[PDB]
């Protein structure tokens, strides 16, 4: 259960460039259906235009995941489309974003315990296009389990996990009405932050919040979060003592003063130690059948013939959950950490993740190199080599 926010009340009177990966869900085999993914990350502002292209032409039915953001405030989103790869068809992803002067086109290259309850809140103004878009997204660990999205005629909280369907109507009604009240606070804060930052009246701006708690197996609060950002930059945050505020900016000092006088840190500490812990306990219980499950990576090495007497070995980890993983290459028992190439871990689109790490090695020396895969789901680390 998310907190009821208090207005920031800053008083009366920033671009990040997207990173893009294009890759298939399953290893491509010509003639057999697959999914092509376009994973776009690390961008701010959240407005973005993603097209997928086949032989230079816009692909019609392209699915878009809901947009999320990470702890560094940057947004991410997965686009995908059904496709059957052929030997000669070219695919690409084209991304248009205010950080870039021209659209970016990225071509598909066949060589491709404690628990936490956190709410990720986004409010984005859209002047001349409608009311601000407001979203509340709840996660137990990294599992999204509830979502409120204002961009609907009769918006309301919806379960994003089957185990939340147990909750009765009184729960959904309470959460929905609280979200609609929260939406109003952020609408007002968006208006007043314009003046506090001496900004023009016609641009889109964003408020982001991370709010929640991390709780140990003994049921004691390990960490509480109440962090705000404006236009992708830190604004104010509750300190680990749950008593004082860090204001990252001159504008936020006005909020800090008001919240001190109003005792907002004590209201937060009570929510965190009370409602937040109790809700997490409740959600962990109903989600017990699925929330603790892990999927171990399946790994294999591919071989790619490079210029002259060098080859690339690529160590793949597929189908794993959660996303945290480590891949290393070894020669003679030493880790080649500085000569590897890696990709950022990326969703397959079915709930599991992919990653690979490659090293360039002398032709004929491939058997001297070992890839190592470290994941919490494995009994012990995987060790593998290239096999013709």
Author numbering: 1 to 13, 24 to 122, 143 to 418
Wording from the paper:
MHC Is are heterotrimers consisting of a transmembrane heavy chain (HC), β2-microglobulin (β2m), and a peptide antigen, typically of 8–11 amino acids in length. Major histocompatibility complex class I (MHC I)3 molecules present a diverse array of antigenic peptides, the so-called immunopeptidome, to circulating cytotoxic T lymphocytes. Here, endoplasmic reticulum aminopeptidase 1 (ERAP1) and ERAP2 trim peptides to the optimal length for stable MHC I binding in the final editing step of the antigen processing pathway. The construct consists of SL8 peptide linked with β2m and Kb HC in which the C terminus of SL8 is tethered to the Kb-binding groove through a disulfide bond between Y84C of Kb and a second cysteine within the peptide-β2m linker.
Based on an examination of the native structure of the SIINFEKL (SL8)/Kb pMHC I complex, and the structure of the single-chain SL8-β2m-Kb HC trimer, we introduced alanine substitutions at residues 63, 66, and 167 in the MHC I HC which interact with the bound peptide in the A-pocket. Positions Glu63 and Lys66 interact directly with S(P1) and I(P2) of SL8, whereas Trp167 caps off the N terminus amino group of the peptide. For the W167A-SCT variant the structure and H-bonding network around S(P1) and I(P2) remain very similar to WT-SCT, whereas the space created by the missing Trp167 indole ring is filled by three water molecules. Interestingly, the side chain of N(P4) adopted similar orientation in K66A-SCT, whereas two alternative rotamer states of the N(P4) side chain were resolved in W167A-SCT. Remarkably, SL8 in W167A-Kb deviated significantly during the simulation and displayed RMSDCα of 6.8 ± 1.1 Å. Examination of the MD trajectory of the untethered W167A pMHC I revealed that the N terminus of SL8 became detached from the A-pocket within 10 ns after equilibration of the system. Partial dissociation of the N-terminal portion of the peptide was observed, however complete dissociation did not occur at this timescale even when the anchor residue F(P5), initially buried inside the binding groove, turned toward the solvent-exposed face of the groove, indicating the strong and preferential binding of the peptide C terminus. In particular, E63A-SCT exhibited the lowest free energy profile, followed by W167A-SCT, both of which displayed the lowest energy barriers at the midpoints of the dissociation path.
